[PDB]
Amino acid sequence: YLKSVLRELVTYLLFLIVLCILTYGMMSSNVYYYTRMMSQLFLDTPVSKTEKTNFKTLSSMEDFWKFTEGSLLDGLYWKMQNRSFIFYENLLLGVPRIRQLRVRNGSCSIPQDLRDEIKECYDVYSVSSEDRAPFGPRNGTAWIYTSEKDLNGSSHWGIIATYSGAGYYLDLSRTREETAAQVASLKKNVWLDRGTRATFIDFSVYNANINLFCVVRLLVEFPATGGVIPSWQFQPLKLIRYVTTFDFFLAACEIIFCFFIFYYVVEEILEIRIHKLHYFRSFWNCLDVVIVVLSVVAIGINIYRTSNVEVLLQFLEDQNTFPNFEHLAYWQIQFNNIAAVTVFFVWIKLFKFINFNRTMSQLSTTMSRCAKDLFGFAIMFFIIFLAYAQLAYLVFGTQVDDFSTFQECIFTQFRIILGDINFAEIEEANRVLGPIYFTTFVFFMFFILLNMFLAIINDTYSEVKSDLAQQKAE
Amino acid sequence: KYLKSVLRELVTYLLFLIVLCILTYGMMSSNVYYYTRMMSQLFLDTPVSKTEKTNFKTLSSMEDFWKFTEGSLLDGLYWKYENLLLGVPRIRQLRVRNGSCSIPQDLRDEIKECYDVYSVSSEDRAPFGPRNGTAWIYTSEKDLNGSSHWGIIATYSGAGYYLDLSRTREETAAQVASLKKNVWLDRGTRATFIDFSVYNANINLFCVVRLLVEFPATGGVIPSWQFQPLKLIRYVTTFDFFLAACEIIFCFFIFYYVVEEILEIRIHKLHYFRSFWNCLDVVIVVLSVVAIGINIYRTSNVEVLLQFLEDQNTFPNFEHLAYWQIQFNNIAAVTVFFVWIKLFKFINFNRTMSQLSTTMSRCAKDLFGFAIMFFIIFLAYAQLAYLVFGTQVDDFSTFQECIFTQFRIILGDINFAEIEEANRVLGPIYFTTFVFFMFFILLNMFLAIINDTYSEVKSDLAQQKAE
Amino acid sequence: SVFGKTLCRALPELLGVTLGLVVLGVAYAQLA
Amino acid sequence: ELWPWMAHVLLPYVHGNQSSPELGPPRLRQVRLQEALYPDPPGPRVHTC
Ligand SMILES: C[C@@H](CO)CCC[C@@H](C)[C@H]1CC[C@H]2[C@@H]3[C@@H](O)C=C4C[C@@H](O)CC[C@]4(C)[C@H]3CC[C@]12C
Ligand SMILES: *[C@@H]1O[C@H](CO)[C@@H](O)[C@H](O)[C@H]1NC(C)=O
Ligand SMILES: *[C@@H]1O[C@H](CO)[C@@H](O)[C@H](O)[C@H]1NC(C)=O
């Protein structure tokens, strides 16, 4: 009991600091200024002049023109002070792609009794019940009655709107003039007709002010029985590999972290081979192995994620006129997992209390004595601090230019505490009783009044120590 | 019985404190700063001439002064900040006499005169130049209401060769040109004073201004200035009636305190100057009595300026008013400090506050006994720095300057760009041995005493509570 | 010989205090 | 202004009567990228390059 409690305790502490450093490094969270604003600019906008037909509450099933020629039209032609400018914070990228899942004839069998009324509506997702003929008016493939299974896309398996591997879809040009013309053609005709169950679209962004990539997916699940459900899944992904003098420190911390994980994995195998095995009913050997297993992950994920992201970002120019550039959806499928896995063990790892009792929090909440003592000091320190302020304001009021207004003497004295004295005109304004002020203020503020605070802290620590020792030795 | 008397004393003290706080705060109007700042910026920042930049703050020769007395001075005084003159400015000169050394016999053939540093015994009372009038004849101090000044180099007398200018620009310019044409600023000059006052009818505020130029016996020029604003009507609206009522109730309060103190000292013949809360009350009473005496003195004679707004032609002697105003401020600003400090006897009603109070009262002896051993070393370093650096740094010129520089070093405000180059050896030694013996040793001893006594007193008090 | 013992014995406490420092420091930026 | 700078201070420094013997001529190795840049909106720099 003289080595371990002094060995893996220290090792775990250093492990804690090491992980918290690159937790800070990872903790960018620029989304609140780069994904919240991006989402508001793309999901908080009025389709009409002023109404409730926004992205929050979809307009209507027959509002194809009212919806596509709206905030969506403000994504291909974002005109501000065909264009990419909404709030001077984001730009365009890739090529737009909208999927119109039309549930055409095949919803239910049509008997000879009452098929003449209705037999083809927007039913649940299926294969032989989806779009099989023109979903309304379409001369050719405007309402394309083809299954896009070979489109290199995986179904989202949506709960509110079931997602399949097939469905009518089309892309837009490098601008919105052609996109608007196609939308108008499909509105005069019928492609997103009443049989359409849900509409899906995916998009990317550049946002050159804060260099990153944005992946956004928009889904409007207009139920056949009425209404429409909005869904917006938007998330960023950046690549900052090596340009700075701080990210190299993060890389070094990651290397140190990998060495620590190697140390803990080369240490755990011996506890099962040499030490008696199949003994995990301790709840402590349980965390030791699961933490290591999770830590092995996100190491072979981060490298793979970085490599894949770099490879994908390399080909970011050939998509100006390319047909489809919405293949990055596979990337986020990993990026969020590493965003989740990293927080599925950083708590778990910090959830280790073998070194000190968990239920002994009675000495971390009875420290209110320290808080009470710290309050009977602020009312014994501000009395002396305000008397000096008054004296300075009365003696040096008219001359110094710093002890001019009472609200300024306070800040001047605080700056004096921070070692920002001037003393060029404090003494000039009054040869005697002026330096006396400064000397006594320094002697009573740094020697006799500062140290009572440290004494209070010292006594709080000693009392906590003594109480804990008495409790644990009773 | 204890609570009743204590609460009576506390409420009386609170009334006294609030009356004093209102009285002092009603004397501070925010325009005094603006007035002094603009006056300084007008008389001290404007260039001496259009093509030059040597303002009065950066005079460097006896010739630049002659340009100042014809440049920025006349423009600022006889303006187009929007003030008006009252009375007439006066210019006075203090000189020393030839032959004030015992010249070494060796080189007595080369040099022929000393103009020794200014002193009362070496002043030149003989007439010089064209014996026209007051500007070339010595006048006694008593003949002209004068007093000492305590300049930067030395304290000057009130005598000297004086001259009163005129009201408008032309005659003053002519008189200054006449003084310049002859040798009035001779090699024997040692001080030059310019004095006047303004009213600035826009806002009711007198201003008395005094400029001093010193010529040391080793050449060069040292300028200094003093601007004192004044408000001497004090009966204009309801606010100053409230102020007068506060003044009279303050006088009643101090009368009650002094009679209580005299009765108390009649009761206790001695052993009364040890509680330390009576030794402070007597100081407060004495300071308040001095303040009220000064106020009576400086308000008795205020009418004398009233017959100066009638545009007289003479010099308004206003040095006493400004001096006593400064003194009264320097007394109010200390009696307020002490009455605020005295409040540390009515906040022992709590538990933590009582512990802090008894802590500070129990470790005062050790702190006072150690402040002697600390200050001995402090003064030793001060004397060392004064002897080594007391000629060329400019931060250790005088003795008290060394102490203030060391105190600033404690706050971490060292320069070290001149300490190391003024003396490459024995200077860095002083700097290094000063930081190791202050931040490591002598500042860890106050904390040790305050750390030990706090724990001891808490232990004793807790045991007594549990006893 | 005590100046090394008193520094090797208090290492866990110093690391704990530094851990407190760093966690409060990362918290200071996590609210941004 | 790089060209006036080089023509005014550097070339007189390299050559001259004696002027600090050099031991080696200079070089101007240079990279292009081929990925033409566009000016940022008004303002020196937003975050980084
Ligand atoms: C076994 C014994 C000797 O008999 C050694 C004593 C070691 C012990 C004092 C050290 C070990 C780890 C330290 C804590 C850290 O892990 C994170 C924190 C969180 C922070 O908000 C406050 C501070 C706290 C609790 C630290 C408090 C002090 C601790 C508990
Ligand atoms: C000063 O006094 C000495 C004494 O002999 C004399 O020689 C000298 O001329 C005097 N100075 C002037 C300017 O006359
Ligand atoms: C001095 O002499 C008389 C008065 O004594 C006066 O008229 C004259 O202007 C003055 N100045 C000169 C240079 O004479």
Overview of this protein structure:
This is part of a larger assembly, with two copies of chain A and two copies of chain C. In chain A, 44% of the residues lie in helices and 9% in strands. Chain A is built from 15 helices and seven strands. Chain A is extended and about 105 Å long. Chain C is mainly alpha-helical. Chain C has two helices and no strands. The longest helix of chain C has 20 residues. Chain C is rod-shaped and about 50 Å long. The N and C termini of chain C lie far apart (48 Å). The ligand C[C@@H](CO)CCC[C@@H](C)[C@H]1CC[C@H]2[C@@H]3[C@@H](O)C=C4C[C@@H](O)CC[C@]4(C)[C@H]3CC[C@]12C binds next to helix 2 of chain C. Chain B: Belongs to the polycystin family. Chain B: This is Polycystin-2. Chain B: It is found in: Cell projection, Cilium membrane; Endoplasmic reticulum membrane; Cell membrane; Basolateral cell membrane.
Give the secondary structure arrangement, pairings included:
The structure is cut from a larger assembly and holds two copies of chain A and two copies of chain C.
Chain A: H1 8-26, H2 31-34, H3 36-43, H4 64-76, E1 77-78, E2 83-84, E3 97-102, E4 168-171, H5 177-188, E5 196-205, E6 213-221, E7 229-237, H6 247-268, H7 270-273, H8 285-296, H9 302-314, H10 329-349, H11 368-395, H12 406-417, H13 426-429, H14 435-446, H15 450-472
Parallel strand pairs in A: 1-2
Antiparallel strand pairs in A: 3-4, 3-5, 5-6, 6-7
Chain C: H1 2-8, H2 11-30
The complex binds ligand A1EQ3 and 2-acetamido-2-deoxy-beta-D-glucopyranose (NAG) (2 copies).
One 2-acetamido-2-deoxy-beta-D-glucopyranose binds at residues 130, 132 of chain B.
The helix/strand series of chain C, from N terminus to C terminus, equals HH
| Total strands of chain A | 7
Oligomerization state of this entry?
A: part of a larger assembly
Number of alpha- plus pi-helical segments of chain A? 15
The value of Rg of chain A in angstroms is 34 Å
- Measured on Cα atoms, how large is the radius of gyration of chain C? 14 Å
Distance between the termini of chain A: 20 Å
- Report strand % of chain C: under 5%
- The first-to-last residue Cα distance of chain C is 48 Å
Molecular shape of chain C = rod-shaped
PDB class: membrane protein
Keywords: ion channel, membrane protein
Entry title: Structure of Polycystin-1/Polycystin-2 complex with 7b,27-DHC
Chains A, B: Polycystin-2
